[PDB]
């Protein structure tokens, strides 16, 4: 009805029905039939076409042409917002715009609409950032829904590592949907089992209880498009945005990132000390709940992997403190006395040092324990409701969040402490700031949104950088590609799921083809019986392997072979040439799943091959 054609791309908007579509080299993408735009309530959905008034403007600026609607009144409530949808002249992007004008609660909107995407084509994919990837072909068997994404398909999470969604019919048109504003965001996913359909939209939530700022999606639409160059438009769209920080960069500041490339991954403990109150207590059970490994016995354990020629290392050591594992944080202090205190803590890391390998402590500041020393709730998150969220189903037992306003004074409390006593770190780990979502606060000393959240979580990232010390935390939810050198792990979906679980699609490093040359990640080295060796997807993802990696928890964390030390040899071999570079190109050879390559920027290819379950490292290109 109102039609805008622009820059190659045309946009049709129908005034009545709300729906649009968008067109460009011959391709045209439109709403689906049936599905609207809407607001959720505590009370109930609304289309966006409920409203009493809505009026309609038709748009041309210097920047770009489009139609801006305003819609009032709903149920009885005077609520009002407006859309803007428009042509950019310089690129011929298509940009969403949903702007607050007057609120006085509003859940969820889910806007823009989702696009039709159809035929059972199954060469016809959509694309997902939950973990480092997967591409969902339209036949593919599994029913996939939001409840099954982890945290509800938020971005800035495991749900959602990077800030979009795309898809990819057969004939090499795609689009790729970016949200500009993703800290109160997150996508929505139904793919019935079969299908024949896979449909994805955008939602956005409050923060703080009010919409508050506009939210922004912009689309734009590929042509002669895989899901390498879908990855390549958002890397671009993130450099150009400053955020796409090299290792290379790093490197410049803190030449010690280097030094990882190459290393074989040591994760391991000292202390567990799993509360009563633990939803982990096994009342039964003492010497369950209650464990212990000294320093010298984890020294003793790194001199004899030296000894038996397991390489160039890097241990990660969970558990160090008095406390005990996940127990007191963010009083995690002083070093565990019955393992051997600050001196057999010292002594360790000496060790390690003088066999040329590197050493990072388990540590943890978002978890806030009643049983800390200095437990207080006025440091704790409120709700948007004004409640402190409360749980027991860590090892410590019963805790709130700390406000991270806070946590970076914690962080330079606790680790100038450690220096304090010659404990010279490598690395450090802070737990759970890049899998779970930003918490917000309404606390008035702290008032916080999930947006500053993140950032002051890079804050503590910037604390550890600045000394010297790399920083790694969870996974790698993208806003802390700037201020994070590496990862616990980014692993696919399917890695955190029972071997036995059915997929929710083909396994496609979707985030190294965006990020490989900014953060660096071990790789899961373990084995399914009947099924994957997981050290080829260490090989296509061109990481580090994992020589030991102890659960904290028996069934948590990826816890689902004899020659381990040569395993790892091949990933460490390949990690320490390609592990600072592009992943250029990832390619299912053939169009076959089961057969992929991997093509790295000096021209090193991986090829896996998941029928033999064999690989194959070439430097021909
Ligand atoms: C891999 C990893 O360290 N996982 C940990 C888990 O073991 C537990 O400590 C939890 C507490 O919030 O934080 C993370 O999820
Ligand atoms: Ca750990
Ligand atoms: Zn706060």
Same mark, same amino acid.
């Given at each position: 009805?109102?039609?805008?054609?622009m820059?190659?791309? !045309?946009?049709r908007?129908?005034e009545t029905?709300?729906?649009?579509?968008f067109?460009?080299?011959?391709?045209?993408?439109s709403?689906?039939?049936?599905?609207?735009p809407?607001?959720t309530?505590?009370d109930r959905?609304?289309?966006?076409?409920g409203a009493?008034?809505?009026t309609?403007?038709?748009?041309?600026?210097?920047?770009?042409?489009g139609v801006?609607?305003?819609f009032?009144?709903?149920? @009885?409530?005077?609520?009002?917002?407006?859309?803007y949808?428009?042509?950019?002249?310089?690129?011929?992007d298509?940009?969403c715009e949903?702007v607050?004008?007057?609120?006085?609660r509003?859940?969820?909107?889910?806007?823009?609409?989702?696009l039709?995407?159809?035929?059972?084509?199954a060469? &016809?994919?959509?694309?997902?950032?939950?973990e480092?990837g997967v591409?969902?072909?339209?036949s593919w068997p599994?029913?996939?829904?939001?409840?099954?994404?982890? $945290?509800?398909?938020?971005?800035?999470?495991?749900?959602?590592?990077?800030?979009?969604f795309?898809?990819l019919?057969? =004939?090499?048109?795609?689009y790729?949907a970016?949200?500009?504003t993703?800290w109160?965001?997150?996508?929505?996913?139904?793919?019935?089992?079969?299908?024949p359909?896979?449909h994805?939209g955008?939602w $956005?939530?409050?923060?703080?209880?009010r919409?508050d700022?506009?939210?922004?999606?912009?689309?734009?639409?590929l &042509?002669?498009?895989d899901?390498?160059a879908?990855?390549?438009?958002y890397r671009?769209?993130?450099?150009?945005?400053?955020?796409?920080?090299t290792?290379?960069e790093?490197a410049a500041?803190?030449p010690?990132?280097? =030094?990882?490339?190459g290393?074989?991954?040591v994760?391991?403990?000292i202390?567990?000390?799993?509360?009563?109150?633990?939803?982990?207590?096994?009342?039964?059970?003492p010497?369950?709940?209650?464990?212990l490994?000294? $320093?010298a016995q984890?020294?003793?354990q790194?001199?004899?992997?030296?000894?038996?020629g397991?390489g160039?290392?890097?241990?990660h050591?969970?558990?160090?403190?008095?406390?005990?594992? =996940?127990?007191?944080?963010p009083?995690?202090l002083?070093a565990?006395?019955?393992?051997?205190?600050?001196?057999?803590?010292?002594s360790?890391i000496?060790?390690?040092?003088?066999?040329?390998?590197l050493?990072?402590?388990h &540590?943890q500041?978002?978890?806030?324990? $009643?049983?800390?020393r200095?437990?207080?709730?006025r440091?704790?998150?409120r709700?948007?409701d004004?409640?402190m969220?409360?749980h027991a189903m860590?090892a410590?037992?019963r805790?709130?969040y700390?406000c991270?306003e806070?946590?970076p &004074?914690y962080?330079?409390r606790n680790f100038?402490?450690?220096?304090?006593?010659?404990?010279?770190?490598?690395?450090?780990?802070?737990?759970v700031?890049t899998?779970?979502?930003?918490?917000?606060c309404?606390h008035?000393?702290?008032r916080?949104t999930?947006?500053?959240?993140?950032?002051?979580?890079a804050?503590?990232?910037?604390y550890?950088?600045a000394h010297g010390?790399?920083t790694?935390?969870?996974?790698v939810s993208?806003?802390?590609?700037?201020?994070?050198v590496?990862?616990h792990?980014?692993?696919?979906?399917?890695?955190?799921?029972?071997?036995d679980?059915?997929?929710?699609?083909?396994?496609?490093?979707?985030?190294?083809?965006?990020?490989?040359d900014?953060v660096?990640?071990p790789?899961?080295?373990?084995r399914?019986?009947?099924g994957?060796?997981? !050290?080829?997807?260490?090989?296509?993802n061109? @990481?580090?392997?994992?020589l030991?990696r102890?659960?904290?928890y028996?069934g948590?964390?990826?816890d !689902?072979?004899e020659?381990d030390?040569?395993?790892?040899?091949?990933v460490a071999?390949?990690?320490?040439?390609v592990? !600072?570079?592009?992943?250029?190109?990832? =390619?299912?050879?053939? @169009?076959?799943?089961?057969?992929?390559?991997?093509?790295?920027?000096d021209?090193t290819?991986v090829?896996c091959?998941?029928?033999?379950?064999?690989?194959?490292?070439?430097?021909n290109?």
């Amino acid at each position: 009805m109102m039609q805008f054609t622009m820059s190659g791309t !045309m946009l049709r908007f129908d005034e009545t029905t709300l729906r649009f579509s968008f067109s460009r080299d011959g391709a045209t993408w439109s709403g689906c039939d049936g599905i609207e735009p809407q607001l959720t309530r505590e009370d109930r959905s609304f289309s966006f076409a409920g409203a009493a008034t809505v009026t309609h403007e038709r748009i041309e600026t210097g920047t770009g042409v489009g139609v801006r609607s305003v819609f009032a009144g709903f149920a @009885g409530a005077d609520y009002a917002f407006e859309t803007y949808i428009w042509i950019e002249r310089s690129s011929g992007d298509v940009l969403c715009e949903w702007v607050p004008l007057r609120e006085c609660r509003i859940d969820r909107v889910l806007w823009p609409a989702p696009l039709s995407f159809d035929r059972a084509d199954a060469h &016809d994919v959509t694309l997902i950032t939950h973990e480092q990837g997967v591409m969902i072909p339209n036949s593919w068997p599994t029913e996939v829904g939001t409840d099954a994404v982890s $945290f509800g398909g938020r971005f800035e999470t495991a749900g959602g590592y990077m800030p979009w969604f795309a898809q990819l019919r057969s =004939d090499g048109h795609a689009y790729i949907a970016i949200c500009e504003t993703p800290w109160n965001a997150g996508y929505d996913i139904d793919h019935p089992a079969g299908g024949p359909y896979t449909h994805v939209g955008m939602w $956005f939530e409050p923060s703080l209880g009010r919409m508050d700022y506009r939210r922004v999606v912009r689309y734009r639409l590929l &042509d002669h498009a895989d899901h390498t160059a879908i990855c390549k438009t958002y890397r671009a769209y993130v450099n150009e945005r400053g955020r796409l920080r090299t290792l290379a960069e790093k490197a410049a500041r803190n030449p010690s990132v280097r =030094d990882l490339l190459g290393r074989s991954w040591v994760h391991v403990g000292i202390k567990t000390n799993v509360q009563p109150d633990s939803s982990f207590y096994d009342p039964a059970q003492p010497g369950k709940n209650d464990s212990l490994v000294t $320093f010298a016995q984890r020294e003793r354990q790194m001199r004899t992997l030296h000894e038996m020629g397991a390489g160039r290392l890097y241990l990660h050591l969970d558990g160090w403190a008095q406390p005990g594992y =996940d127990n007191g944080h963010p009083d995690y202090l002083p070093a565990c006395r019955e393992a051997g205190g600050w001196k057999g803590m010292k002594s360790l890391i000496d060790a390690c040092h003088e066999q040329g390998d590197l050493f990072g402590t388990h &540590d943890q500041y978002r978890d806030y324990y $009643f049983a800390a020393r200095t437990f207080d709730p006025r440091n704790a998150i409120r709700l948007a409701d004004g409640t402190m969220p409360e749980h027991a189903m860590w090892a410590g037992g019963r805790q709130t969040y700390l406000c991270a306003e806070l946590a970076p &004074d914690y962080v330079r409390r606790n680790f100038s402490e450690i220096a304090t006593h010659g404990i010279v770190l490598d690395c450090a780990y802070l737990d759970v700031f890049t899998c779970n979502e930003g918490d917000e606060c309404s606390h008035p000393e702290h008032r916080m949104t999930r947006r500053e959240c993140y950032e002051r979580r890079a804050e503590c990232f910037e604390y550890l950088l600045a000394h010297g010390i790399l920083t790694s935390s969870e996974e790698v939810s993208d806003w802390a590609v700037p201020s994070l050198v590496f990862c616990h792990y980014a692993p696919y979906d399917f890695q955190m799921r029972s071997p036995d679980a059915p997929r929710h699609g083909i396994p496609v490093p979707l985030y190294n083809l965006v990020y490989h040359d900014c953060v660096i990640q071990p790789w899961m080295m373990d084995r399914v019986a009947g099924g994957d060796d997981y !050290m080829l997807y260490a090989l296509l993802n061109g @990481g580090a392997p994992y020589l030991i990696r102890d659960a904290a928890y028996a069934g948590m964390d990826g816890d !689902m072979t004899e020659n381990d030390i040569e395993r790892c040899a091949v990933v460490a071999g390949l990690h320490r040439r390609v592990g !600072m570079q592009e992943l250029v190109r990832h =390619d299912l050879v053939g @169009g076959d799943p089961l057969v992929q390559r991997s093509v790295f920027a000096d021209g090193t290819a991986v090829t896996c091959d998941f029928h033999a379950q064999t690989y194959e490292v070439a430097a021909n290109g």
